[PDB]
Write a structure and sequence with these properties.
This is part of a larger assembly, with six copies of chain A. Chain A is α+β, with helices and mostly antiparallel strands. Chain A contains two helices and five strands, in the order E-E-E-E-E-H-H. A five-stranded antiparallel sheet of chain A has the order 1-2-3-4-5, with no helix packed on it. In chain A, a hairpin with a 3-residue loop joins strand 1 and strand 2. Chains in contact: A-B, A-E, B-C, B-D, B-E, C-D, D-E, D-F, E-F. The interface between E and F is large, with 66 and 66 residues. The PDB classes it as virus like particle. The entry lists the keywords virus like particle, ssRNA phage, coat protein. PT=3 virus-like particle of ssRNA phage ESO003 coat protein. Chains A, B, C, D, E, F: coat protein of ssRNA phage ESO003.
Chain lengths: ~110, ~110, ~110, ~110, ~110, ~110
């Protein structure tokens, strides 16, 4: 939406189901919010997809440095408590240092230290 | 690794590249740490993949309630500054209310309030 | 044979190698003892098979709730020492909490606690 | 898991769904815990398979003396009371001498004594 | 298992018959424990293979600096006295200076000094 | 070179790139020092192979009891610091108890104790 990690993200593009934001300062980060509503294709009401990804591309040759994507896929009938729990758990795990080592090290949380 | 959102996640399974944890209390939440090291298929050193996923299924009828997935695809040579900035932005974005509303509402960050 | 887990099991049917008992009180539990004598198909004296299974079905709609089966396959020549050791080990393992969690949790004995 | 029938069983192998332990003292007993999660193939949520087997193989020629296996197959939706009743009934039947005769004797519980 | 040569080795990956440890500090040293059970392909009980190897790969371009591997091939029936003697002789020879010359100099124990 | 594990090893045969020592007392243990120079088959200066193996053969019928072999494959250009580190890590790992379990038990460093 707005300033994250001391970088200001302004809207660059808006689609029916995608909003894209760029820094416009370092011209290397794009933040995308993506939306797929659930489709009642059976007795199930479908799963509501979301996607929040940050892409970093160096602005000299256009090489993709890296992508971090947060994707959610939750039942349309699912409760807010179910949806609150899923984000609370994944947020606590991200704050944990195991995830910080899973990224940057390819290290699983099974070390005996 | 351990207690997230006040729930204790004890190890459920271990693979070559996946470590799965279960609450075993509510018997419904599984946290997986997935690893995919870069492959030097060309002059590029490859992309180091990681995946941090939380799954909730109700353990009586076994219908998937929801999945929230955190995936990373970062160049093997990418500097930790690029790597840390990628984590800093996405965690800042997640803590922001736009991500909270993208889930639970399928609301894109374009509302005029 | 007779009262197990405070439930009285009266004989329900008899076969050449199977004896089946029923509670007849909750009309839902059936205990089967199955026999399979070793056959000397080669220089081996064969394997003596036994089976002790408990079956629960709800006696209104007849859906199987669950089965627990205790099967044995012991050489006909095997000494009573090996047979007693096998029973002692398996009963000790069942009395241990690891079996109690493997059932009702699908939890393998690998948690670090 | 640990000492059973005065024998220390230590981890020898860990799979996705099997844990194998050996005595490492008499080098003849292997205890395996095995896990199959229920699969929702229909309106039924599936059956959760457990297996607890003790195999004895004498370590001079490696011939299988005997196997005692405890297998459970319980509905995913089944109540914890159902599983408790199943385990209690099967353990009480195992503690009875009828099972101790069925094993080692191929004797059905129908004698008049 | 743990700190060797003042460097900390944490478990990098766990396999059925392989356990691998990575320094994760210098990101160039990998210690692997490999297992291979003896096979009774004949009257003989087979040879029990073990492997303990350290591999150094330069972590900027990926050039293998060196490998020191310790492999064992011991009869499945061999006594613990043989197994202790084999490990004792080879460990003493490694502590001898002739090994430190065979490595780093390719000097055989035949020079007259 | 000389007395290892309180056994006297005297030179049995001398080759161009192999030196072999025999106990000559138990007439069952042979220690071999094998050499192999690096080959500059390309731009790379090649890999310098070393080998230190102890072989036990039963000296009445000639049945191989076991072999423990230490082999090195180090870049011809590798620094002495790399070569010292490689020998230091592997020697420390052998002195660790995990090796003494991998040999004589085929126990991997993954048991939870």
């Amino acid at each position: 939406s707005k300033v994250f990690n001391t970088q200001t993200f302004d809207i660059y593009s808006t689609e029916k189901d995608v909003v894209s934001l760029r820094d416009f300062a370092n011209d290397k980060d794009t933040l995308a919010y993506k939306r797929l509503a659930p489709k009642r294709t059976k007795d199930s009401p479908g799963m509501a997809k979301s996607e929040l990804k940050i892409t970093r591309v160096d602005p000299t040759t256009g090489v993709l440095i890296g992508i971090v994507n947060v994707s959610s896929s939750i039942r349309a009938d699912a409760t807010a408590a179910d949806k609150t729990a899923l984000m609370a758990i994944i947020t606590a795990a991200q704050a944990d240092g195991a995830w910080t080592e899973l990224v940057t090290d390819q290290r699983l949380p099974l070390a005996t230290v």
